[PDB]
Design a protein around this ligand. Structure first.
Ligand SMILES: Nc1nccc2c1ncn2[C@@H]1O[C@H](CO)[C@@H](O)[C@H]1O
Ligand SMILES: [Ca+2]
Ligand SMILES: [Ca+2]
Lengths: 314, 314
């Protein structure tokens, strides 16, 4: 009885580890689509790696092909105009360039580049028979777009929106000359969109802010364990990426199984003014403000084992 | 018959690609040892990756084990601390952490740690029945040391030195506020040792400066071709290292087959004074100054095809 899931990411290492986690857990998750945003990665690269991972898996296990869209979303505050995306690097990974798999990608490529990510997310959620879980591991610009365009017609079709982003009771990670460091990148990239989502009633939001994601670090001894499963392509793929925080992986791990963490209802608002704390997710005492279920104290061992086992799907 | 060879590297990405070229070509090369310097890497990381690569190949293609030593050389001008981490990443790579290989490495790890790199190099060249070819892909600190300590007892046993470093008729790659950009990193790291090596009459030198290494770029299309050989452990290894220029690889290539490039005799001196051009390799007027054979116009295709084929050894 797998549930419909859509992955809304921005093509980074953990975004792809998160993709693998959703896709390899066929018993609990039916991945019906994915979209890429040109934030923490050049969309072109993020799009290609998404296709390459889907095909590698499609040809080795039970994984139906799904549509992949590039989002026309634009940044309000762009990521480090230096180093970020490793999507280009991954694009050259040998495990993702096996001829039979790239051949499939070349063949089904044209169909996908015809979609516009934002509209695709809307159509996958709204045309679905059963509800869909949106796993957002990049900015919230796309979920807000759908909300602003289709309102309740869109949200009522959402099972729940599992989000990686924010910093509630801990410091953020956006450290620029104009920021005080209380905000987190995914939110800071487009504060306005984040406000729309976090303030939209009728939408169940699971929030994986830095409060929870900072508790699951990437440690060498764990990563080395993938060397024990080199007979599985996914172990070579995941081990390699991590050899290079597991925020997005944790977020996707929850969609796979709730036991990853307990949630705590908190009224979340977003700072949109052009101040040092722009993009910070704060608490609001506004009367009956929609509550967001903030993830806390993640079962780290449960997650790490989930990932190790999942990398054995193929 | 194959020739004796020792690899003197500093554990960066192309140093390891070079090691794979040398070790895999058993018919031409008999790798009798390697040392790792704490230059463009943190020696301990480069140490282990060397052992992991050695053991992976030993258990999969009959590559005789050999001693690996840690050079005690210390920098004159340290490398950018942002580059020296590559070895760390490689140490966690799935393909280098297979159990049977790590078990072997862990058994022979202590003994190799007993060696001092420099002394090891001197002892391997001096105690060899046949002459030895030294492939230097990191600073020249170790060769300079052996020359100072044992003079001709050492250099007389050296078939030739194939070195990656310097910049003769082109600009260097060392750009700091206090430099003029004419020096290359391997020399800048330790100019004095470099001057000793280049000025030593009694030593045969093959120099792959930037003049030749800049003419052979390693592009994405090429790298992706290792995706056609994921059934070979080394193709996964090499293609992966790059996904994360190949000056060092060209140098090892020459050692495998000299058809890689033609050479030109040039009398090379090294600027050791703390000047804007410190570490620059310059032509000198000194009469009877020893000649160095500078690589010219390397054979691009030949090299690429050599590496692609060599990545199929196991
Ligand atoms: N980005 C970079 N620029 C210059 C040299 C670099 C480099 N990354 C690694 N190197 C090292 O420096 C030498 C070439 O200058 C090589 O031995 C190589 O291992
Ligand atoms: Ca992300
Ligand atoms: Ca090097």
């Amino acid at each position: 009885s797998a549930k419909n899931v859509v992955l809304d990411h921005d093509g980074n290492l953990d975004d792809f580890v998160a993709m693998v986690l959703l896709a390899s857990n066929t018993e609990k998750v039916r991945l019906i689509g994915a979209l890429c945003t040109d934030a923490d990665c050049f969309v072109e690269n993020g799009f290609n790696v998404t296709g390459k991972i889907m095909c590698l898996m499609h040809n080795n296990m039970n994984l139906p092909l799904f549509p992949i869209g590039k989002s026309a979303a634009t940044a309000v505050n762009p990521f480090p105009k230096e180093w970020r995306c490793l999507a280009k690097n991954m694009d050259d990974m040998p495990i993702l360039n096996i001829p039979e798999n790239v051949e499939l990608w070349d063949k089904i490529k044209a169909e996908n580049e015809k979609y516009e990510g934002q509209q695709l997310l809307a159509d996958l959620v709204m045309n679905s028979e059963e509800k869909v879980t949106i796993c957002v591991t990049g900015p919230l610009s796309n979920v807000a777009w759908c909300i602003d365009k289709y309102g309740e017609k869109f949200t009522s079709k959402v099972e729940e929106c599992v989000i990686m982003g924010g910093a509630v009771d801990v410091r953020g990670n956006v450290f620029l000359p104009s920021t005080d460091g209380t905000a987190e990148w995914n939110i800071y990239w487009d504060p306005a969109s984040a406000k729309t989502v976090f303030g939209c009633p009728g939408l169940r939001r699971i929030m994986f802010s830095l409060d929870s994601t900072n508790t699951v670090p990437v440690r060498s001894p764990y990563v080395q364990r993938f060397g024990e499963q080199t007979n599985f392509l996914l172990s070579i793929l995941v081990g390699t990426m991590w050899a290079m925080y597991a925020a997005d992986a944790l977020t996707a791990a929850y969609v796979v199984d709730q036991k990853v963490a307990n949630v705590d209802p908190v009224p979340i608002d977003v700072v949109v003014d052009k101040q040092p704390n722009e993009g910070a997710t704060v608490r609001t005492d506004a009367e009956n403000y929609p509550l967001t279920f903030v993830a806390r104290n993640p079962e780290a061992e449960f997650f790490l084992d989930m990932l190790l086992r999942s990398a054995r799907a193929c």
